[PDB]
Design a protein around this ligand. Structure first.
Ligand code: CLA
Ligand code: CLA
Ligand code: CLA
Ligand code: CLA
Ligand code: CLA
Ligand code: CLA
Ligand code: CLA
Ligand SMILES: CCCCCCCCCCCCCCCC(=O)OC[C@H](COP(=O)(O)OC[C@@H](O)CO)OC(=O)CCCCCCCCCCCCCCC
Ligand SMILES: CC1=C(/C=C/C(C)=C/C=C/C(C)=C/C=C/C=C(C)/C=C/C=C(C)/C=C/C2=C(C)CCCC2(C)C)C(C)(C)CCC1
Ligand SMILES: CC1=C(/C=C/C(C)=C/C=C/C(C)=C\C=C\C=C(C)\C=C\C=C(C)\C=C\C2=C(C)CCCC2(C)C)C(C)(C)CCC1
Ligand SMILES: CC1=C(C/C=C(\C)CCC[C@H](C)CCC[C@H](C)CCCC(C)C)C(=O)c2ccccc2C1=O
Ligand code: SF4
Lengths: 340, 39, 139, 739, 69
């Protein structure tokens, strides 16, 4: 936390998650409980989407949110964009459900059996003890999360190359994509038309390039400690790293909301509905060209608008926490109105 | 505004905000699910 | 019962063809006409409510009944324990005139444990006061 | 002569969280729940908070600006609802057939049935306020002008709010600025009333006359020229009136006779649209502007000429009146309640004059045809006028209790009138009893003569007839007026005195109202109830100081329940309880007045018209021989005409039925507060405090019953609310059913 | 035989506070009939109609008070 003086600070219940921000074990426990909640939502809602799926209609009109996310990977897709056999969606939903179960079990284990601070441990638990002031352990955690995201990108790459086939909007069948792009100059040139790429080989080439970039960043962050040039320009607290991550996930949400509404192959038009139109009224939303009867919207509209609004409010959360990390009081803005 | 938080938490404004929230959720539940004499 | 069900009543089938649209949904009268078909009606074509306690008609009475018996108890417990925790701070009069709205929001959220808390307060003796320490009126 | 103090009160929000700070006994602490009611009973009693005549006056001035913001946001809501959610351009396309509606209802629980088919495919609730005819009289064409007028009204609402904050917390005026009453009087005469009348005379000349002229010619909407295009091109105005080619130059040389083609003295009604002539009202507002600004220079302020009112009041003293008005100029510039009593009396009588003039001379186009607009505007202005007159009777008593100093006004008119209070009230109640027997016992007498089967002994026209000869002679003089005693007037002042039947769109605008013996009896009923309400309020004014029952009434206050059960009993003896009784008597008086209006106008005036000249009315002429009986008032009026409120379910007039029954509920709920006393409810509430103390849920705010004055106040409030809501629902549903 | 600030229940059987607890503000000298000044938090029905509050302090006797401390 910030703690502009008053080192022994007490937070009330409406800021109740600020109480464990200094301790270590509850800091692990709350986050793995949150990951259990995300895995539970994923598995339980693709099961709920299998429960409320009709094969006599098109996909995106009935609010199909997760089954197009699995059909773009090409798991149970047939011919012409038709889904007749849904075994592996139920398989990955059950996998995510039991994964949420074991993650919640570990969360309650760290809340109950593991102590608050990991400095009282003796074996490997003392090596996992972290503080918001030393950047070395934070760099180790940073590099290992970099390595895990790179491993996830490599798993997606193997799903595109060896472990299965992806889906395209041209042939509307599965496709075993091999021999991707190997040139980084055209990847440097992809900063202008990244929204419409229209080729899956370029997609898996960009994915293996960003995956190898992530592995390089991971081994770089594990190998060298963080330097001194960034410690003079970046703040080192809980709310500072919270702010950097909040701005990162808000930018990622804006990027994903732009990617959802205009793409055609990473979001097929028969699975998510037609591509959208960026329409600014009061706020910039995404409207469909055709109008659904029961005031309804496609999955593309729901995904793009929800991710845009969540990215917007996460940007203001980054703003709140980043101004908090710079020393602002925030009753100073109430004292500025009260002095007036 | 150390007095505006106390004025917005007086009895009439809080009971009007609570009745506005109650009437709001009642009207919304009666729009999306109308005409429920029983269960 | 002597009342005909709405699935075969002639007056109800004559009146269901022109049920008025209440909301902005133009098919609201038709979906009401098929929703009220499960109920039973008299000789006028209006759905009566069996209230005797039989569970085959519990959806008429008992299913909303206990639903209200949650929410009223919720409001009652939120109104009761809040008064207890403003029995003293420094002065209860201003805390009853202006609301300590974080304390009120805390009770308003935590009020959904009210029936187990009611049996707990009844067993602990802190629910019902004694018949002698209560400020009664003179006879 | 401006005296302004700079920053008297700091602007702060911390006082908003401490309710009851304005009074000394409320800011201590809410030990009891009656403090809550006292917080609303003394929130505007500015004379009990401050006692220096300077803080209260600037508090009043800023309160006037706040209330002006409330009226401006209300007027903005009317123009915004007429812009967005109405059919004003659709009604302007066809005014005779379709009906106006300026409120659309959200269909949520089945209340979409309130959006009745008002004509032209537009759904909504048909308005009866009749401000659409105001807009057609002013010259509105499309909804964008109403929208920009609503926007400008909200701008002036925020402007009046900023002026209130500026005049209380930044630059507040002194007491000498408020006591400059001669400067206030002549500025309000010339610069507010006369200058505003000249502004509306200019708008009626330039905008309201040419637009209504070509609308009476038959020009469709989206073909009228814009109102500024008549000023930008004066040829379009000169082709409608020949006098506009003469320019401003005949006005300054007193050649006003060439202006006679567009400043006419026609009078009567316009036969094409069924309203007043717009040239007549333009000439009218110009004449009122000239007379007011002439009278706006009577009082001296700084330049020597002018009447200071002090020696005006000094000069009027006769033999009966002692020292005359010696002291009233010091009274009316040092006490706001005496000014409030005079202004509420004259604004109440003005509002009743407004109602009594806006039915026989309908000033708006297509207003007399719409019977619902005419009936609603009449009765609403009647009720506002009667309410303000009761407030005059209240603030007279408050002036007597807390603003009357007897050492300053010795042997003047106020002291002499308080010295013979018995010789005033003991004749006022005599004429109350004489009018009561001779206006109600007439009704009982012919009720009994009709019930005993002898109609030849009644007070009918075929029976012993009480012909009202004086108003019939006055109607004869008004019929004989144009040509003998008003030679430049073509028609009469109205067609209610005598003349032809004005028919516009198959309905009757105004036909002559003959006065039989039923109008004789009901006018004496009106004079009787006016005398009783002017008895209760006048004996609340005079007997507020002291009496022979209780001579210590000034020290007890204006608003106290009683002196006690002694002297036989002294409950309802204050000056407040006379207002409490006068409110019911105003309710009874105005209910009979609007009943006489509604029945006489829908039996002898309104109805459809036929092309051979015969007129059939709505109730086929019932007022002649059946308005003289109490059973006739019950059967032929309250039973026969309430059927349109009764049988209107599943239709557009369905909310009026559940407002009819609602008003009956609030009347019957008022009887609980009026009949019962406090000590029963205190003895019951303390038992509920026992039942709360058994479960440890008794509140630390001590819960106890209302005060005795509070119980009478909520009783009279729910009584007047329930009766007026019942009459509102009945009048609106009936006159919307008859067209 | 009471101190200054101890809780005590009332057994007046005719007062407003009958069974309610009160704090003894002071005990006056002997000889007088009702020396025990007791103050309460709940005011009684006192004053004119429409008054914002009443009184709480009162002189009580010794044999009609039950000490609860
Ligand atoms: C995703 C939801 C989530 C998760 C995983 C947690 C997790 C946690 N909360 Mg928590 N909390 C949440 C939502 C959540 N909260 C919400 C919504 C509120 C507001 C009602 C709170 C209010 C709250 C308080 C007031 C406290 C916790 C505390 C704790 C910690 C438990 C420590 C213990 O056993 O004692 C744990 C890390 C406790 C803590 O960290 O104290 C050391 C604590 O005192 N929480
Ligand atoms: C990476 C995500 C993240 C994390 C870890 C935190 C963590 C923290 N924030 Mg926070 N915040 C975030 C995002 C995040 N915030 C965003 C995106 C916003 C913008 C809206 C804010 C705005 C914000 C404010 C304004 C404040 C905090 C505060 C705090 C600290 C106290 C704990 C707390 O939140 O109270 C516990 C949380 C609750 C009691 C929840 C409140 C209940 C809300 C109103 C209901 C949820 C709204 C809605 C229904 C959500 C669903 C959306 C949609 C599906 C309908 C804690 C360190 C507080 C602080 O620093 O004080 C010490 C503080 O005052 N945050
Ligand atoms: C929330 C506080 C609260 C609670 C727990 C109770 C509880 C009770 N009241 Mg009650 N009452 C309350 C407030 C409350 N009252 C208020 C504010 C009033 C004034 C309108 C009354 C007037 C009242 C009467 C006249 C009677 C009772 C009776 C009773 C008892 C029977 C149940 C009943 O009929 O209640 C039903 C409750 C009502 C009819 C009125 C309460 C309605 C309000 C809206 C409830 C919520 C109040 C408050 C705004 C919530 C506070 C929330 C907090 C966070 C601020 C029961 C012990 C009866 C009795 O003596 O039983 C033997 C009885 O005859 N009450
Ligand atoms: C000739 C100039 C002039 C004009 C036009 C006015 C006009 C007005 N005065 Mg005013 N006044 C004047 C000179 C003038 N005064 C002088 C010289 C004095 C000091 C002797 C006062 C002292 C005075 C007092 C003490 C009060 C007024 C009030 C009012 C308002 C009366 C009702 C109302 O709100 O109408 C409706 C509004 C309009 C018609 C708008 C016309 C004005 C626009 C903004 C110009 C009105 C705006 C009363 C008030 O505050 O009302 C809000 C009030 O209490 N005046
Ligand atoms: C406050 C009221 C008001 C206002 C702003 C105007 C404004 C105007 N009048 Mg005017 N007028 C008014 C009242 C008013 N009048 C009244 C009461 C009468 C009747 C005596 C007239 C009779 C009148 C005539 C006869 C003419 C004007 C004309 C004009 C315009 C020419 C400018 C000028 O100096 O004059 C101007 C827009 C002249 C015009 O048509 O120009 C467009 C013109 O010929 N006016
Ligand atoms: C120019 C108009 C005017 C002004 C400035 C005043 C000003 C004043 N009057 Mg007053 N009065 C007026 C007109 C006016 N009156 C009229 C026309 C009447 C006759 C009805 C009265 C009758 C009257 C009485 C009987 C008393 C006053 C008193 C007072 C003083 C204190 C006001 C107070 O405490 O009320 C604060 C405000 C309220 C209590 C709000 C009243 C709410 C009403 C009752 C309900 C409104 C019903 C509503 C329209 C319907 C919808 C509600 C619901 C159904 C949704 C104050 C100087 C009092 C006084 O001087 O005592 C010493 C007093 O006892 N007045
Ligand atoms: C319908 C019920 C009713 C009736 C009849 C009256 C009647 C009267 N009220 Mg009244 N009043 C009422 C309800 C009623 N009030 C209510 C509800 C309130 C509450 C606010 C008031 C408040 C009120 C005040 C505040 C005042 C009156 C006054 C009066 C008297 C005015 C004089 C008059 O009209 O001549 C007399 C008229 C009648 C008696 C009615 C005519 C009936 C016939 C003609 C008489 C019977 C004929 C014969 C005697 C029968 C003989 C049979 C034999 C066996 C005896 C009158 C007696 C005033 C007063 O007394 O001073 C003047 C007064 O100041 N009233
Ligand atoms: C009517 C007779 C008339 O108006 O006289 C009014 C008369 C006026 O008295 P003076 O002629 O003394 O009035 C001089 C006044 O102008 C000074 O206020 O006063 C009365 O006689 C009071 C009785 C009125 C009630 C008369 C019965
Ligand atoms: C708040 C809080 C917290 C947190 C926690 C959490 C948030 C949790 C979560 C957790 C979770 C979230 C969990 C999950 C679980 C899971 C489960 C419970 C599952 C189950 C399922 C099943 C068993 C299924 C089955 C199946 C299959 C497999 C297939 C076939 C069919 C079926 C569907 C049947 C803590 C403690 C830290 C602290 C305090 C507070
Ligand atoms: C089922 C049913 C029925 C029956 C019922 C009955 C028969 C009843 C009875 C009843 C009774 C026999 C009752 C008793 C009671 C008693 C008492 C004694 C009570 C208690 C209460 C209390 C104590 C309160 C408390 C509370 C709560 C709980 C919550 C809130 C707060 C308060 C505090 C208020 C019928 C037939 C109708 C119909 C069908 C169904
Ligand atoms: C019933 C009654 C009471 C008791 C009055 C009470 C208990 C007042 C009731 C007030 C309750 C709390 C209702 C609240 C009033 C309004 C409904 C508040 C509006 C709140 C909404 C806007 C939410 C008296 O004190 C009294 C005194 C003198 C003569 C007659 C009577 C009398 O008849
Ligand atoms: S009944 Fe009430 S108002 Fe009348 S004297 Fe007795 S206490 Fe006073």
């Amino acid at each position: 936390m910030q703690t502009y003086g008053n080192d022994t600070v007490q937070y009330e219940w409406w800021a109740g998650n600020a109480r464990f921000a200094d301790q270590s074990g509850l800091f692990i426990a709350a986050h793995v409980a949150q990951a259990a909640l995300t895995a539970f939502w994923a598995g339980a809602f693709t099961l709920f989407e299998i429960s409320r799926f009709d094969p006599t209609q098109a996909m995106g009109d009935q609010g199909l949110i997760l089954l197009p996310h699995l059909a773009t990977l090409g798991w149970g897709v047939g011919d012409g964009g038709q889904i007749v056999d849904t075994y592996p969606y139920f398989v990955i939903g059950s996998i995510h459900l039991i994964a949420s179960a074991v993650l919640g079990a570990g969360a309650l284990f760290h809340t109950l059996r593991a102590p608050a601070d990991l400095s009282t441990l003796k074996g490997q638990g003392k090596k996992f003890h972290f503080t918001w002031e030393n950047p070395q352990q934070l760099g180790i955690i940073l590099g290992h999360h970099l390595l895990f995201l790179g491993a996830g990108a490599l798993l997606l790459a193997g799903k595109a190359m060896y472990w299965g086939g992806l889906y395209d909007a041209t042939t509307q069948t599965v496709r075993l994509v091999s021999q991707p792009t190997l040139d980084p100059l055209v990847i440097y040139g992809y900063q202008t038309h990244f929204a419409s790429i229209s080729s899956l080989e370029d997609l898996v080439g960009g994915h293996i390039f960003v995956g190898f970039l992530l592995i390089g960043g991971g081994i770089w962050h594990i190998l060298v400690p963080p330097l001194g040039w960034a410690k003079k320009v970046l703040l080192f607290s809980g709310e500072a790293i919270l702010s950097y991550s909040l701005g990162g996930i808000a930018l990622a949400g804006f990027v994903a909301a732009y990617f959802c509404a205009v793409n055609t192959l990473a979001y097929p038009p028969e699975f998510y509905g037609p591509p959208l139109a960026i329409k600014l009224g009061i706020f910039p939303y995404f409207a469909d060209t055709v109008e659904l009867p029961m005031h309804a919207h496609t999955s593309r509209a729901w995904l793009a608008n929800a991710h845009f609004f969540l990215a917007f409010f996460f940007l203001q959360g980054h703003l709140w926490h980043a101004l908090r990390a710079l020393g602002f009081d925030f009753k100073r803005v109430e004292q500025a109105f009260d002095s007036l | 505004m150390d007095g505006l938080k106390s004025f917005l938490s007086t009895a009439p404004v809080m009971i009007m905000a609570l009745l506005t929230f109650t009437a709001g959720i009642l009207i919304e539940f009666n729009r999306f699910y109308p005409d429920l004499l029983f269960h | 019962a002597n009342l005909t069900p709405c699935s075969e009543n002639p007056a109800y089938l004559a009146k269901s063809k022109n049920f008025l649209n209440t909301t902005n949904d133009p098919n609201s009268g038709k979906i009401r006409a098929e929703r009220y078909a499960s109920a039973l009606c008299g000789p006028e074509g209006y759905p009566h409510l069996i209230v005797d306690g039989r569970f085959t008609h519990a959806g008429d009475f008992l299913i909303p009944s206990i639903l209200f018996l949650y929410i009223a108890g919720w409001i009652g417990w939120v109104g009761r324990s809040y008064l207890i925790e403003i029995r003293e701070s420094k002065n209860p009069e201003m805390q009853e005139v202006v609301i300590n709205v974080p304390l009120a929001i805390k009770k308003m959220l935590g009020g959904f444990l009210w029936p187990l808390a009611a049996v707990g307060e009844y067993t602990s003796g802190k629910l019902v006061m004694k018949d002698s320490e209560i400020p009664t009126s003179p006879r | 002569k401006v005296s302004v103090d700079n920053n008297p009160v700091p602007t702060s929000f911390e006082k908003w969280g401490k309710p009851g700070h304005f009074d000394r006994t409320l800011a201590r602490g809410p030990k009891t729940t009656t403090w809550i009611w006292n917080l609303h009973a003394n929130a505007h009693d500015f004379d009990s908070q401050t006692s220096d005549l300077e803080d209260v006056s600037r508090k009043i001035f800023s309160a006037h600006f706040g209330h002006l913001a409330v009226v401006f946001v209300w007027l903005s809501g009317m123009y915004f609802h007429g812009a967005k959610f109405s059919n004003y351009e659709g009604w302007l396309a066809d005014p005779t057939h379709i009906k106006p509606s300026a409120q659309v209802v959200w269909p949520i629980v089945g209340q979409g049935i309130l959006n009745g088919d008002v004509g032209g495919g537009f759904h909504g609730i048909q308005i009866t306020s009749g401000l659409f005819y105001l807009w057609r009289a002013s010259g509105f064409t499309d909804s964008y002008q109403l929208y920009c007028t609503a926007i400008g009204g909200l701008v002036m609402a925020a402007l009046m709010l900023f002026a209130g904050w500026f005049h209380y917390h930044v630059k507040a005026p002194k007491l000498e600025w408020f006591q400059n009453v001669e400067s206030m009087m002549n500025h309000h005469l010339a610069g507010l009333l006369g200058l505003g009348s000249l502004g509306w005379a200019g708008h009626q000349i330039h905008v309201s006359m040419p637009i209504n002229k070509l609308l009476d010619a038959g020009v469709a909407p989206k073909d009228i020229p814009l109102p500024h295009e008549f000023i930008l091109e004066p040829s379009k105005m000169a082709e409608l009136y020949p006098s506009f080619a003469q320019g401003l130059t005949p006005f300054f040389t007193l050649n006003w006779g060439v202006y006679s083609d567009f400043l006419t003295f026609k009078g009567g009604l316009n036969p094409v649209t069924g309203g007043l002539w717009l040239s007549d009202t333009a000439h009218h507002h110009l004449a009122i502007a000239v007379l007011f600004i002439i009278a706006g220079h009577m009082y001296r302020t700084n330049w020597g000429i002018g009447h200071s009112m002090k020696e005006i009041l000094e000069a009027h003293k006769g033999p009966f009146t002692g020292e005359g008005h010696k002291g009233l100029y010091e009274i009316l510039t040092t006490s706001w309640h005496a000014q409030l009593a005079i202004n509420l009396a004259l604004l109440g009588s003005l509002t009743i004059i407004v109602a009594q003039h806006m039915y026989a001379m309908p000033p708006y186009p297509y207003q007399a045809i719409d019977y619902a607009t005419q009936l609603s505007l009449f009765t609403h202005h009647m009720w506002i006028g009667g309410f303000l007159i009761v407030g005059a009777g209240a603030h007279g008593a408050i002036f007597m209790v807390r603003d009357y100093d007897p050492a300053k006004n010795v042997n003047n008119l106020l002291d002499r009138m308080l010295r013979h209070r018995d010789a005033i009230i003991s004749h006022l109640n005599w004429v109350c009893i004489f009018l009561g027997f001779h206006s109600f016992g007439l009704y009982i007498h012919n009720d009994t003569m009709r019930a005993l089967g002898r109609p030849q002994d009644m007070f009918s026209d075929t029976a012993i007839q009480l012909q009202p000869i004086f108003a019939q002679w006055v109607q004869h003089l008004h019929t004989l007026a144009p040509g003998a005693t008003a030679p430049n007037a073509l028609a009469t002042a109205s067609y209610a005195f005598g003349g032809e039947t004005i028919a516009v769109a198959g309905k009757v605008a105004m036909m002559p109202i003959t006065l039989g013996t039923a109008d004789f009896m009901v006018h004496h009923i009106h004079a009787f109830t006016i005398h009783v309400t002017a008895l209760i309020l006048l004996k609340g004014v005079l007997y507020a100081r002291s009496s022979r029952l209780v001579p210590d009434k000034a020290n007890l206050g204006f608003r106290f329940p009683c002196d006690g059960p002694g002297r036989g009993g002294t409950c309802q003896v204050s000056g407040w309880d006379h207002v409490f009784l006068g409110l019911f008597w105003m309710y009874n008086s105005l209910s009979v007045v609007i009943f006489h209006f509604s029945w006489k106008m829908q039996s002898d005036v309104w109805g459809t018209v036929s092309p051979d000249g015969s007129v059939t009315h709505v109730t086929l002429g019932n007022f002649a021989q059946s308005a003289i009986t109490i059973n006739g008032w019950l059967r032929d009026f309250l039973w026969a005409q309430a059927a349109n409120v009764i049988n209107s379910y599943g239709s557009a007039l369905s909310a009026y039925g559940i407002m009819f029954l609602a008003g009956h509920f609030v009347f019957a709920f008022s009887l609980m507060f009026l009949f019962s006393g406090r000590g029963y409810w205190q003895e019951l509430i303390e038992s509920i405090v026992w039942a709360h103390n058994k479960l440890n849920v008794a509140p630390a705010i001590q819960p106890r019953a209302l005060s005795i004055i509070q119980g009478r106040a909520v009783g009279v409030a729910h009584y007047l609310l329930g009766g007026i809501v019942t009459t509102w629902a009945f009048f609106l549903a009936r006159s919307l059913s008859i067209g | 035989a009471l101190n200054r600030g101890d809780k005590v229940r009332i057994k007046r059987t005719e007062s407003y506070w009958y069974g309610d607890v009160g704090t003894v503000a002071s005990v006056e000298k002997s000889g007088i009939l009702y020396p025990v000044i007791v103050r309460f938090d709940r005011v009684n029905y006192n004053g004119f109609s429409g008054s914002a509050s009443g009184v709480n302090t009162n002189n009580f006797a010794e044999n009609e008070l039950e000490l609860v401390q």
